[PDB]
Structures are given as structure tokens and as C-alpha cells.
């Protein structure tokens, strides 16, 4: 089973972006990670995953933030980005077309 408890993740932008994409941000629905680039800084941390909700970046609350102000935050976070993430597959799947959550907590797209 995948821990559902919140976690703190420090990513290092360094050369390129943060290596991941987000969705949501409409009506305080939240901001979720929908894709992680292989070899990117997010992947390199090996702590994040698709389905994770960004609760905050460098302390700035982002739960009820919008995709645009979340993008702005992440982009301003700097070289050393600290992220508070929480696995929410069910809440994430309603965002991805033809996606669902199997009985192991994993997100599946038929």
C-alpha cells in the first residue's frame, strides 16, 4: 500500500524545470501531479508520483490555489524547492479521462 500520509519533498531545479506537470486548480479542487518526466528533477528525487497533490511549495499554501498561481509559485520557488505532497489517487483520477484506481491504490488508464 502507498502511504497516504503527507510528505515533504526537496527537489533541485538546477538546470531545467522541475520535471513534472500539474492539473486542476479550478474551484479549490487542488493541484495534482499528472506526469513526471523521466530523468527530470522530480524523478531524480524518487519521492513524487502522479496522483500526488501539492499542498504547498516552500511553505506557500497551494491546496486551494489555481493552476496559474501554482505554476507561478513553482517557478519562483528557486533552485531548492521544498514540496509538501499527499497521495490522492481517487481525487486525481476524476481529472484524467478513462482513469481509475485499482485495489492496490494505483491509478490505471484503460
UniProtKB/Swiss-Prot annotation:
Modification after translation, per record: Palmitoylated. Palmitoylation is required for targeting to postsynaptic density, plasma membrane and synapses. Palmitoylation by ZDHHC2 occurs when the synaptic activity decreases and induces DLG4 synaptic clustering. Palmitoylation by ZDHHC15 regulates trafficking to the postsynaptic density and function in synaptogenesis. Palmitoylation may play a role in glutamate receptor GRIA1 synapse clustering. Depalmitoylated by ABHD17A and ABHD17B and to a lesser extent by ABHD17C, ABHD12, ABHD13, LYPLA1 and LYPLA2.
Q: Which organism is it from?
A: Rattus norvegicus
Q: What does this protein do?
A: Postsynaptic scaffolding protein that plays a critical role in synaptogenesis and synaptic plasticity by providing a platform for the postsynaptic clustering of crucial synaptic proteins. Interacts with the cytoplasmic tail of NMDA receptor subunits and shaker-type potassium channels. Required for synaptic plasticity associated with NMDA receptor signaling. Overexpression or depletion of DLG4 changes the ratio of excitatory to inhibitory synapses in hippocampal neurons. May reduce the amplitude of ASIC3 acid-evoked currents by retaining the channel intracellularly.
Where does this protein reside within or beyond the cell?
A: Cell membrane; Postsynaptic density; Synapse; Cytoplasm
PDZ domain ranges (all copies): 8-88
Q: What is known of its domains?
A: The PDZ domain 3 mediates interaction with ADR1B. The L27 domain near the N-terminus of isoform 2 is required for HGS/HRS-dependent targeting to postsynaptic density.
Q: What does the tissue specificity note say?
A: Expressed in brain (at protein level). Detected in juxtaparanodal zones in the central nervous system and at nerve terminal plexuses of basket cells in the cerebellum. Expressed in cerebrum. Expressed in hippocampal neurons (at protein level). Isoform 1 and isoform 2: highly expressed in cerebellum, cortex, hippocampus, and corpus striatum.
Q: Out of the domains of life, which is the source?
A: Eukaryota
Question: What gene is this protein a product of?
Answer: Dlg4
Any idea what this protein is called?
Disks large homolog 4
Share what the entry says about its subunit structure, partners included: Interacts through its PDZ domains with ANO2 and NETO1. Interacts with KCNJ4. Interacts through its first two PDZ domains with GRIN2A, GRIN2B, GRIN2C and GRIN2D. Interacts with ERBB4. Interacts with KCNA1, KCNA2, KCNA3 and KCNA4. Interacts with LRRC4 and LRRC4B. Interacts with SYNGAP1. Interacts with ASIC3. Interacts with SEMA4C. Interacts with CXADR. Interacts with KCND2. Interacts (via first PDZ domain) with CRIPT. Interacts through its first PDZ domain with GRIK2 and KCNA4. Interacts through its second PDZ domain with the PDZ domain of NOS1 or the C-terminus of CAPON.
Please state which protein family the record places this protein in: Belongs to the MAGUK family.
The signal sequence is none
Amino acid at each position: 500500500d502507498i502511504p497516504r500520509e503527507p510528505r515533504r519533498i526537496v527537489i533541485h531545479r538546477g538546470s531545467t524545470g522541475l520535471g513534472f506537470n500539474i492539473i486542476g486548480g479550478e474551484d479549490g479542487e487542488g493541484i495534482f501531479i499528472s506526469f513526471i518526466l523521466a530523468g527530470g528533477p522530480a524523478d531524480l528525487s524518487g519521492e513524487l508520483r502522479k496522483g500526488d497533490q501539492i499542498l504547498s511549495v516552500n511553505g506557500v499554501d497551494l491546496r486551494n490555489a489555481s493552476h496559474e498561481q501554482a505554476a507561478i509559485a513553482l517557478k519562483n520557488a528557486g533552485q531548492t524547492v521544498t514540496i509538501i505532497a499527499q497521495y490522492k489517487p481517487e481525487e486525481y483520477s476524476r481529472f484524467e479521462a478513462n482513469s481509475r484506481v485499482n485495489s492496490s491504490g494505483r491509478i490505471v488508464t484503460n
